Design a protein around this ligand. Structure first.
Ligand SMILES: CC(=O)Nc1nc(-c2ccc(F)c(C)n2)c(-c2ccc3nccnc3c2)[nH]1
Length: 328
């Protein structure tokens, strides 16, 4: 990397470069190793994510714990898949490694979005009925592009987030969300019908019914695409459940808070979803605006305790794409 180069020039030179692929290793490496960590801004089992500057430009640095090396690899593998780089899918910058044995350091460097995750934004603020759409449409524009199975030269195989939730969604400056945390994600090659997979994963909450009572078929790459939606459905609930309309904007709450204890189990969740087939009670005061209902629609159009029955991702994309025209 030459004197004066800016992260912008890198990314630009990249997108507009021959192949729609990430930056050259040696370069990704140079970046990671010259980043200037600022201060931790979030932790987890996956490790911990910090905020840092690269030659002045802020950046996000997710730092895994050697013990969690595979989680690191998968993301690195995926965020670099042939041509996945939507406007709603976390801009991947680089991945690197550093020591030996017990202390090996694994990093993933992305783009920094001040606002943070939805689960934080939905707690710090109260979106507009207008914003509720940008946020919900983008998420949808994203999960679409992720399942969007292209084919040919370098057709991005269809991918399934396998763990979409209010925390793994980041919101930009212009109130545009973007998918993130593709660690548990899986790919699907259409030219040989394969899946690089392998049990019950994801957050014990937004788990779809198929998985909860185990009666799901992993042979067909749909059981995956499907569960993506239901979960993305629960996420919509939270968004509007925190939307303002003249004063009423019920406190933020995680899906199924009044039914099962905080930090649920597979059993405690399997009872209120499989059995009771109960969903987050959509307050009656919801049938107010023409938009607000479209959500309450999709929200149940997703909460079907039946796989195939759920709406497609690409769909909600088109429907909210239209409801975006007529409104605002
Ligand atoms: C659960 C959770 O917080 N997941 C999660 N993974 C990442 C991340 C960061 C860098 C990177 F390269 C990759 C691939 N992912 C982030 C993330 C990304 C950008 C952020 N920008 C500001 C604040 N927090 C952020 C947090 N959040």
């Amino acid at each position: 990397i030459s004197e004066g180069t800016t992260l912008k020039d890198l990314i630009y030179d990249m997108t507009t470069s021959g192949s729609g692929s990430g930056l050259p290793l040696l370069v990704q490496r140079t970046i990671a190793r010259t980043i200037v960590l600022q201060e931790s801004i979030g932790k987890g089992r996956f490790g911990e994510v910090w905020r840092g500057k690269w030659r002045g430009e802020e950046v996000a640095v997710k730092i895994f714990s050697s013990r969690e090396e595979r989680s690191w690899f998968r993301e690195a593998e995926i965020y670099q898949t042939v041509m996945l780089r939507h406007e709603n899918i976390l801009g991947f910058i680089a991945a690197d490694n550093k020591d030996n044995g017990t202390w090996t350091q694994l990093w993933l460097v992305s783009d920094y979005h001040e606002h943070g995750s939805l689960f934080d934004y939905l707690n710090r603020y109260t979106v507009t009925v207008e914003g509720m759409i940008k946020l919900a449409l983008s998420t949808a524009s994203g999960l679409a592009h992720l399942h969007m199975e292209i084919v040919g030269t370098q057709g991005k195989p269809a991918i399934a987030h396998r763990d979409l939730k209010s925390k793994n969604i980041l919101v930009k400056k212009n109130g545009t969300c973007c998918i993130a945390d593709l660690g548990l994600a899986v790919r699907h090659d259409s030219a040989t019908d394969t899946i690089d997979i392998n049990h019950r994963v994801g957050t014990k909450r937004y788990m779809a019914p198929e998985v909860l009572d185990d009666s799901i078929n992993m042979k067909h790459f749909e059981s995956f695409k499907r569960a993506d939606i239901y979960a993305m459905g629960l996420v919509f609930w939270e968004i509007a459940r925190r939307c303002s309309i003249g004063g009423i904007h019920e406190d933020y709450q995680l899906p199924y808070y009044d039914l099962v204890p905080s930090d649920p189990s597979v059993e405690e969740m399997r009872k209120v979803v499989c059995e009771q087939k109960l969903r987050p009670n959509i307050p009656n005061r919801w049938q107010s605006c023409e938009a607000l209902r479209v959500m309450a629609k999709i929200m149940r159009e997703c909460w079907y305790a039946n796989g195939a029955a759920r709406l497609t991702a690409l769909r909600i994309k088109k429907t909210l794409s239209q409801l975006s025209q007529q409104e605002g």
